[PDB]
A paper describes a structure:
Pro-survival homologs (six in humans: Bcl-2, Bcl-xL, Bcl-w, Mcl-1, Bfl-1 and Bcl-B) are structurally similar, but oppose apoptosis by binding and inhibiting Bak and Bax, as well as sequestering pro-apoptotic BH3-only proteins (BOPs). Interactions between BCL2 members are mediated by an amphipathic, helical BH3 motif that recognizes a conserved hydrophobic cleft present in the effectors and pro-survival proteins. Here we describe the computational design and experimental characterization of specific, high affinity protein inhibitors for all six pro-survival BCL2 homologs. As confirmed by biochemical analyses and X-ray crystal structures, the designed proteins engage the BH3-binding grooves of their specific target pro-survival BCL2 family members.
Thus, in lieu of generating a combinatorial library, single amino acid mutants were screened with BLI, and three mutations improving both specificity and affinity were combined in αBCL2. For example, the binding mode of αBCL2 in the hydrophobic cleft of Bcl-2 differs significantly between the crystal structure and backbone-constrained design model; after Bcl-2 alignment, Cα backbones of the αBCL2 crystal and design models deviate by 4.0 Å RMSD (average amongst the two complexes observed in the asymmetric unit). The SSM-guided mutation of 2-CDP06 core residue G107R is likely responsible, requiring the first and third helices of αBCL2 to shift relative to the BH3-mimetic helix and positioning the third helix much further from Bcl-2 than the αMCL1•Mcl-1 binding mode. The αBCL2 binding mode enables electrostatic interactions between αBCL2 R107 and Bcl-2 residues D111 and E114. SSM-guided αBCL2 mutation G107R contributes additional polar contacts with Bcl-2. (B) Designed αBCL2 residue R50 is tolerated by a more spacious Bcl-2 binding pocket and interacts with Bcl-2 E114. Designed αBCL2 residue D47 is partially satisfied by Bcl-2 R129. The αBCL2•Bcl-2 crystal structure reveals that Bcl-2 residue D111 makes a hydrogen bond with αBCL2 N57, satisfying a polar atom that is likely buried in the interface when binding other homologs. Like αMCL1, αBCL2 expands the classic BH3 interface by 452 Å2.
Residue numbers in the entry:
A (entry chain A): 7 to 32, 87 to 209
B (entry chain B): 3 to 117
The structure:
């Protein structure tokens, strides 16, 4: 059980891209999960924007390098555990690599990057998400921050 | 007392930065014993950026928890919508202060790496 993580990833990357004028075409999850995650992610990027900017500027990115870069970051991110904030950092990291890809005229890399996010979720984060109440726990944790906006 | 929520979140954030300093010292110590190429050095800088990402994640998470507590206080009537607005404001300046400190820790990691 729990929600389909491919769907979560697709909607999330789709929204990051369409919010920048790019149209990306490539158990069923409630709207509220999607909406909660795009808002927590936008909130994270607003606070930590300067850090991603320094990352993404210092990024030589090629179809053949991209996976290694993604791997190093997420390995260090989850080295000694998971929590919801690391998960949100994860999502926005993968979003920044997608946006950089379209910026550098390497749009087909967004499909690969969405695959890597999906496999990392399914293979490494899933059982921790489930043990900690699923994506519904996240919705509940972030609600108090939502109700301010 | 509404201030105590902000104080616990500060405590957590300041601890997490000290853990970061620690982690970047581990990273620098096991860089030192080796002797590096450009590829290897860029990898360490990237691990340092990822270690900061992680700290930022943890502090973001500490802030989600502070806001959830804040909401309970509001329901118990121990804080109001304005003080909750002030708390939000302080928690964002906090995130930025912690972020600035982590960046200084990075820049100093590199300066140590190369020189």
């Amino acid at each position: 059980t729990g929600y389909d993580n491919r769907e979560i990833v697709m909607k999330y990357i789709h929204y990051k891209l369409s919010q920048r004028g790019y149209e990306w075409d490539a158990s069923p999850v409630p709207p509220v999960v999607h909406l909660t995650l795009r808002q927590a992610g936008d909130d994270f990027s607003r606070r930590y924007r300067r850090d991603f900017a320094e990352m993404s500027s210092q990024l030589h990115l090629t179809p053949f390098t991209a996976r290694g870069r993604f791997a190093t970051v997420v390995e260090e991110l989850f080295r000694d555990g998971v929590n919801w904030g690391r998960i949100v950092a994860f999502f926005e990291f993968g979003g920044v690599m997608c946006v950089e890809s379209v910026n550098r005229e390497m749009s087909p890399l967004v499909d690969n990057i969405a695959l890597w996010m999906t496999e990392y979720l399914n293979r490494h984060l899933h059982t921790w998400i489930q043990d900690n109440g699923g994506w519904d726990a996240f919705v509940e944790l972030y609600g108090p921050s939502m109700r301010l906006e | 007392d509404p201030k105590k929520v902000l104080d616990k979140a500060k405590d957590e954030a300041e601890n997490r930065v000290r853990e970061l300093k620690q982690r970047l010292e581990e990273l620098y110590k096991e860089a030192r014993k080796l002797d590096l190429t450009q590829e290897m050095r860029q990898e360490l800088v990237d691990k340092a950026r990822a270690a900061s990402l992680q700290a930022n994640g943890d502090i973001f998470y500490a802030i989600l928890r502070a806001l959830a507590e804040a909401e309970k206080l509001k329901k118990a009537g121990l804080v109001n919508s304005q003080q909750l607005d002030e708390l939000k404001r302080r928690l964002e300046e906090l995130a930025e202060e912690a972020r600035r400190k982590a960046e200084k820790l990075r820049d100093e990691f590199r300066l140590k790496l190369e020189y």
